[PDB]
Homo-oligomer: A and B are copies of this chain.
Amino acid sequence: AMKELINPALQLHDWVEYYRPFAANGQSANDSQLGICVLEPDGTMIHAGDWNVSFTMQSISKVISFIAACMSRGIPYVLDRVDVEPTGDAFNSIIRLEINKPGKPFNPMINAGALTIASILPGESAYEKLEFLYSVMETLIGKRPRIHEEVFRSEWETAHRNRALAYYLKETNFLEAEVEETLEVYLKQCAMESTTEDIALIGLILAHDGYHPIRHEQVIPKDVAKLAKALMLTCGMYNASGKYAAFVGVPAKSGVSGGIMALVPPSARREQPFQSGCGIGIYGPAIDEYGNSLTGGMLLKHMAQEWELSIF
């Protein structure tokens, strides 16, 4: 049940049960859900809690779109539109777009940068851009992603903050597409559905520098896979990234819907557990002030401390 192909299992069971209650300290912006899936290169998979419950990727999708953009346009082209620096600000902060002239978004993990990324995906319309993104997604999890239309429609009507960012980006020429078209792509990718298993698989692929261990094929260029991991570590948890690097030490990416995708490169897992590295998928709807899963973050920290996963 808890272990299959596609101590640790028991520990995860116990940890999920222990941390679940802390959800009362966070918000969803069912809060008590907590699930996790850990995947190894040989297909070995362990999970606990609400690991098979579907949720929208939200910001986790930013890692995929950034990778897709890099694969299509090449890293140099992407770098001319977005930098790779932490802002020290909230994920949806607009400040630097005006203060840091010319106004290039600081990184592709914050909303501003992710909007620029969405606008540079190949395609003449939102439909083509998304089809390209879905094709990349398909090579990763082996299936065309399903869009949670109810959530998309919900976010589409209340995305005032994101529209502000997009229009400011348009103003300063850091959008390679029309605003509404960009918003559509951005909100649609955020609405792609996933369970902890899917993001654990994407995590595993990145851990192995773009090589898909189950299909035995290089699906993401190594240099691009490496770049994604670096951005996850420095900006993946926004203005909480520093704390995560210091007290967890594993590249991770959150989504305000409560998901967290993390990964551990080979050997950086402690000789005993997951020596060959692993992909990690976590789900905990209750999020903190930074937008990161509260119970999911605590669970990850515990795993990293206990199994010595830190890459530092």
Interface positions of A (Cβ within 8 A of B): 83-89, 96, 106-107, 226-227, 229-231, 233-235, 239-243, 245-246, 249, 251, 265-268, 310-312
Question: Given A84-B243, A85-B243, A234-B241, 7 more contacts at CB 8 Å?
Answer: A106-B242, A226-B312, A230-B245, A231-B246, A233-B312, A251-B312, A268-B268
Q: Are B242 and A107 in contact (CB under 8 A)?
A: yes
Known: A86-B234, A88-B96, A241-B85. A312 touches B246 (CB 8 A): no
Q: Are A242 and B235 in contact (CB under 8 A)?
A: yes
Q: Which of B231, B242, B267 contacts A85 (CB 8 A)?
A: B242
Question: Which 6 pairs across A and B sit closest by C-beta, in order of nearness?
Answer: A85-B242, A86-B86, A88-B88, A229-B312, A230-B246, A87-B88
Residue on B nearest A312 in the bound complex, by CB = B229
Count the copies. Answer: 2
Q: Which of B87, B229, B242, B265 contacts A234 (CB 8 A)?
A: B242
Q: How far is the CA of A229 from the CA of B312 in the complex (A)?
A: 6
Q: A11 to nearest B CB, angstroms?
A: 21
Q: How far is the CA of A246 from the CA of B106 in the complex (A)?
A: 13
- Chain B contacts for A107, CB-based, 8 A: 242
Q: Are B227 and A246 in contact (CB under 8 A)?
A: yes
Q: How far is the CA of A158 from the CA of B260 in the complex (A)?
A: 47
Known: A86-B88, A88-B86. A312 touches B230 (CB 8 A): yes
- In the assembled complex, 9 residue pairs joining A and B whose CB atoms fall closer than 8 Å, in A order, are A83-B242, A84-B243, A84-B246, A86-B88, A230-B246, A233-B234, A233-B245, A265-B312, A267-B268
- Chain B contacts for A249, CB-based, 8 A: 226, 230
Q: How far is the CA of A68 from the CA of B43 in the complex (A)?
A: 44
Q: How far is the CA of A266 from the CA of B240 in the complex (A)?
A: 27
Q: How far is the CA of A246 from the CA of B234 in the complex (A)?
A: 9
Q: A122 to nearest B CB, angstroms?
A: 23
- Chain B contacts for A83, CB-based, 8 A: 242-243
- Chain B contacts for A265, CB-based, 8 A: 311-312
